[model samples]
Each structure stands twice: as structure tokens, then as C-alpha cells.
Target: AQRVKITTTATPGEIELAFEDTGTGLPVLLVHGFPLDRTMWKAQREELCDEFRVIVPDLRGFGESQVIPGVATMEAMADDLAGLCNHLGLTGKIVLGGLSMGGYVAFAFARKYRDRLAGLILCDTRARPDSPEAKENRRRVAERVRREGPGFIAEEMIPRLCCESTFRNHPEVIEKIRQMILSAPPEGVAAAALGMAERPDSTDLLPALSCPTLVLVGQFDAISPPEEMEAMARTIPQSQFVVIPDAGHLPPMEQPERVTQAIREWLRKVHTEAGHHH
Candidate 1:
């Protein structure tokens, strides 16, 4: 919480993006998952703040950020991040990372603005487009949330979003995540769901990545299983991979200490390699 502070600016879309900045140095912009807000990065913010500047945003429609009614998509949110970076005077390269839905947003960011990234981190996400069935399911979920509210989202998503071990062993974490889901604005959740459904396939964008990259996956992640993430890592010419043990989709939340350690190590490597190239 290092005296957490806020700042904002309007993107080209006239979207007012709210962001939190902690510590100072090389910037790491962490994105939150769908139906969640910037608060989801609390662990990373507190841990990484000692060594690196960490910026977390609520995306376009989540948390404190304002959304354009029914207009929320990954590309639009990615541009919002770009605008935030410019607002913060971060004209240089940055370390960009995200999880699940955040990962999708990261890919969109990379596709549009890779030149602004020194490194990339993808956690618990896939590069493929959603199957037709999955897209339809996302639309259905959005409509349901819009009609039924966050209670329905919390009940339905919490179980599948985390590992079985978490359910059995980490009831406290479950409660925290449950509260996060329940507290999210239903309109925001609905907009994000629809946006996710419209996201382009990112598989084609991997091979072109020019910066150092790290891919992480929870050993038990049901959504973007480790094997798929490993394959995704291989697609990037300059990428490394780590699998967090005893975790699921949300390793940053489920095992923050371990995730921090892994990120710390990988970031060191990224810097070392970046230095060599220089």
C-alpha cells in the first residue's frame, strides 16, 4: 500500500482511465482479469514496489475507470493503457503483464504497441480465439450478468476460475475473490464479457514478438492449462516459461510469493539479456 496514489487522463476514445502507481524505476504495467479491478494486483503492487514502478489500471469498464456505456473491447482497453502510459510520461519501453482476461488485453496491447514494450509477461491465458461455442457462452454470460447481476457471476465464475486445491485448502482466498466478483459493477462485467467475446485470435501475433517474454501458468489452471501456455511460450522466439505449483488460474492471487519470486528472476534475466543486446 506504499501510500498508493491515483492519476488519470482521457484516451483518444474519450475514455477516462484511472491508474495506480507505486514505487519507481522501470515500469511494469499489470492488467486485471475480467470482472475484476486493479485491486486484484494488490500483491504484485506491494511486492514489486520496492524494486520497480508498478502501474495497475481498472481497464476501461472495471474498478474506478469509466467505460463508454456499451463500448468496451480489448483493443479499446489496450489503447486506454497506451494513453495512460503517455499521461505518466512513460515514453520509453515498459514491462507489460496480465492474467486470464488481462492476458488477452496484453496481447491486444502487444499487437498494437509492441514498440513500447521492453518485455512481455503472459499468465494463465491462451493465444487462440474462443471457439464458437465459447464465444456464444461468453455472450450468454454477459446477458445473464446484465439481467441477474454480480451475484450470479460470483457464484458461477469462482469455482472454475481457481484450482480445486484452492477450493479445498484456501477458503480465505476464495472469500476474497468472491467479494471482488460480487463487488464489481454488473454493467462493467457485462461489457467486459462481450468485449472478450470479440477479441481477435492472438496466436498469429506471437512469432513477431521482438522483446524478451515470459509466460507463466498455474500447474492446475483449468482455463489456460500449462501445456497450452508452454506451447504458446515456444511460439515466441525470445520467451521463457515458468509453471507455478499448487495453483490455478490466478497464481498472482493464489501464490503471490511464488509468483513474485518467479517474476523477479525472469525480470532479472530480461534485463540482463536486454543489456547484452544493447
Candidate 2:
């Protein structure tokens, strides 16, 4: 296991977030999607850490952090993470990115702090209201986790997420994801679920983003389809979107090489452009 060195920040006295960074250079703040934790960003940790300080944190109410008792929304988590950034003395723009729900956060953070980024990287995520269909399904899941406890990760969500090619062949990895979810505090899942159910519609903010951005998607992702990705590619002014083949829902895990290549290529071009900009 890679032993993580961590740093933390608090909510003006209400919340706290601990983040881990490995390697040298600018920081890439990574947030995870629902039913997952910072572990979900493991693929980028080793790959990007050499050129960039990759920062991954358990959301305030998930994984190993201090869980907020009742607040369970991305906005609140976004607030906590932003506070974490301020607490750590990160005064300049950092590459803020997230996957799935984390993508939702990357977008939210971008809006809340207009000049707070050197770049934005959103993967396997979207910028819209949960379709009535998606929101209703989450409503059912939220109710279950709230009432039955967090153990359902093993019983329900993980299996569906992994698919047969994954569950049958890559049992260890699938189990790891499930364990991360199962280990999350029960209230954390319940809280996130409720927050997701009530997530603000950010469809309006899509056209306003002006940062150099990367929009990543898994070709077969059922959780967030490619068409939505196309919509994102079309909406953001200077953003690039990619669809990695043979992957779905979780690109960092299923297609690490593709994810890494797409991001690094974009970053490299951006780096070259920075020189040109001057």
C-alpha cells in the first residue's frame, strides 16, 4: 500500500477535510463520485504525481474524514473542500477536478470561485439536473442506505457498477471498491444520497465556463452516457472531451492508461501554450 501523507483544513469551526498529496509541482485536487471515495482517483495518483502534486481527499462526510452528522450534499462538501484549500494556504489556482459526483463538485467549485483554477478536469461527469429518472432512482437508494445501513454496497451498487467483465474477472478490484463504500460511515452515504437527490441544476452554468478544461467519459458508461459527454464538449468553450473504449462509469479504474494519456496530452499542450501566451 502507498502510505499517504496528509494535510487538513476546517470549516470556520464546523467541518474538516484532510487531503493527501504525493510528488512535486502544482496540485491537482481530486474529488470522488457517489458510492466511492478518494481511492477512486488512485489511477491518477501515481501517474500524475511526478509532474503534478496530486491531492485526493475523502469528502468531509465520507471515507476516513470527520463525518458531518446530517448535511449530505455536494454543495456542503464543496464548501468543506474549498475551506480545506484555504486552510492549507493554497492561495493560487489549483487544478480542481472530480469524477462522477466529483465532476459535479469540480463544476460547483469552479462557479463558486471564478478565478480559482489553473485548469479544470471533469471526468465521467455531467452538468445538469439529475433527469427525473436519475433523481428518483437515487431517492430509492438513499432511503435504503438511510434505513438499512451502509452494508448494501456489497449487496447492491458495486455489483451493478462493475458489470460481468469486471466482477467475474477482476474480483479483487471490484471488492476493493465495494469495501471502500462499505467502510464509509453509514450517515455519509445517507447524507450524500440526500444531497444528490437535491443537487442544484447546473445546466445553466455549462455555457459560462471559460477555463481550459478536459471532459472525460467512458464509452459504455451507463451511469453517465456519452451523449451527455457530447453535450458537455459542445457547451464548455475551451474544453476537450474524450471517450475511452472498453470502459464505463469508472474510467480511472477501468481505463487508467487512456485517462492518463488524454489528460497528460491536454496538459502538455496547455503547458506549451502557456509559453506561447507570453
Candidate 3:
């Protein structure tokens, strides 16, 4: 990942962003999920970069980015992203995608700045905010991260994050995920958890989205169930939805081949649609 300097109204001073942009085609910005850095999208970056400009960023407080104490609000993260796009002069349309917490930030970005988005890909994330009970748990987890450390997240999340097929067949994937979780800065982890808990519900924001949106859900994602995401697909006019087989919450990592193919085909469709309109 590369580093860029940016200043936003949300934060007092300029901050350093750890990001990577590889390949030489249309720009595609991918945001990583909570407690996980840009490294989680390693497979997609390698696979997509050859044919598309794939940009992945470690959101503020994760990886090498500045980790500030307190909440990392989705809006502020969106501001950081806007600053990055401005810095790079990424005008026109850029494909925007995110997983889990990343999806929340993507939605925030869409709400505040629609002009920059060419398309969208929402992976293993939902439009609803955390339920009251879920919000409590998030705050609790924030404290737990501060107290018990990063190892606890791996133990707690692994079972929920992957399908039985992945765990039984791909030990390497398991280890990789575990390491990503542990690599996160403790304050970053806490900030993200609290930020997610504070995030507004995005269900109302879906119908107004004007871009070619693609929704990818793992076949067995307990966190964001297929039926729920199918509803999301239906609400967003002209959105493409795919349920990845043999995967759970993190399909991009668990089933990269299928994820890659789905996105490639979708990108072609988006370009073709834009050509027809123009």
C-alpha cells in the first residue's frame, strides 16, 4: 500500500492514508472492513489490477493510517475518501465497493458525494443499522478490544465469518484472516467498533442511488443473510445481485474466483450501459 497526505474538515490536521492503486484501467476503489486492513483484499487486488485500476485503502486508524482515539465515524471516513479522490484528481466515474464496515462508509460517501461514483459493489454488508442489542454489543466489544486485546476478535469472529466449507477445506484462508484481525491497531479496532455502532441506517438511502450497483452476498452469510441482501438488490433500481456459493460473510476471500468473475462481468455491463447512454 502507498501513503498519501490529506486534510479533512472532520480532523484538525492532515493525515496520512495507507492505500494502493495498481494496474491501468478505469479506477475502482475498494474499502476494507472493520478491524481488517487493505491486506484482506490481496487476492482481488492481484486478480483485478491487471485489467482494472484497483484501489484499496486501509481506512483511518487501521493499518498504517493515523489512529485517533474516539469514534471513527463513517462520515469522517467518507470525508477522508473524498479528500483522497480530490488529491488524485479522480474525476468522472469510479467504481466504489466495500465489505461490512466498508460498505457503511461507501454508503456515506454516496450520500454526501454522488458525482464521483461510476458504480458500486456492496459485499457481505447490509443496509440496516445495528439493532439496539447489536449496538450494545459493539460498544462492549470496543471495551473488550481495549481490555482483552486483538486475539479475542479472531476467536470470536472466525466462526461467524466463514462457512463450514472454508474452515474444513482451507486452513490457509483461516490463518490469513486471523492474522489480519490481529494485525489491526487496538485503538483502530475500538474506534471502528464504536463507529459502526454509531452509523446511521442506510436502508432509506438505497432507492435513490443512481449508479449501476452490484450487491454480492455470501450464500451462507449469517451476518447479512441472502434474503436480506436480495431485498436490498430489489430496492436499488437496476442493481445486479449475486450470491456466491460455498462462502459465508467474507466471500471475496473465501471464494475469490467466483467473486472476481462476477465483478469482471459486472464491470463490462456497466461500461456497456454507459456507452449506450452517451
- Please say which candidate is ahead in TM-score: 2 or 3: 3
Best of the candidates, lDDT: 3
Candidate 3 lDDT, tens digit per residue, 1-278?
A: 68988876577456789998888778888999978989888788899887788888888889888887898899889888888877877656788999989999999999988977888999988899989999999899899897777898888789999999999999899999998888898888898899999899899899999899999999999988999999999999779999999999999899999998999889877844354235
Tell me the lDDT of model 1 at 185.
Answer: 75
* Candidate models: Cα lDDT each: 0.83, 0.74, 0.88
**How does model 1 fare in lDDT?**
0.83
| Candidate 2 Cα errors over 4 Å, as ranges | 1-12, 131-139, 271-278
Model 1 lDDT per residue over 1-278, tens place: 21212232323446666677998887889999978888888888889888888999888767777755574788877887887788778877889999989999899989888888889989999899888998898888888878887898788778888888888888988998988888777778888888888889998799999898889999999889999999999899888899999898899888889999888888776744354245
Pick by lDDT: 2 or 3, better one? 3
TM-score of each: 0.92, 0.88, 0.95
Q: Pick the candidate with the highest TM-score.
A: 3
Q: Over the stretch 132-221, how does candidate 2's per-residue lDDT look in tens digits?
A: 887887777767877777786567666556546665666677778778878777777777777787878877787888678888888878
For model 3 the local lDDT of residue 228 reads 92
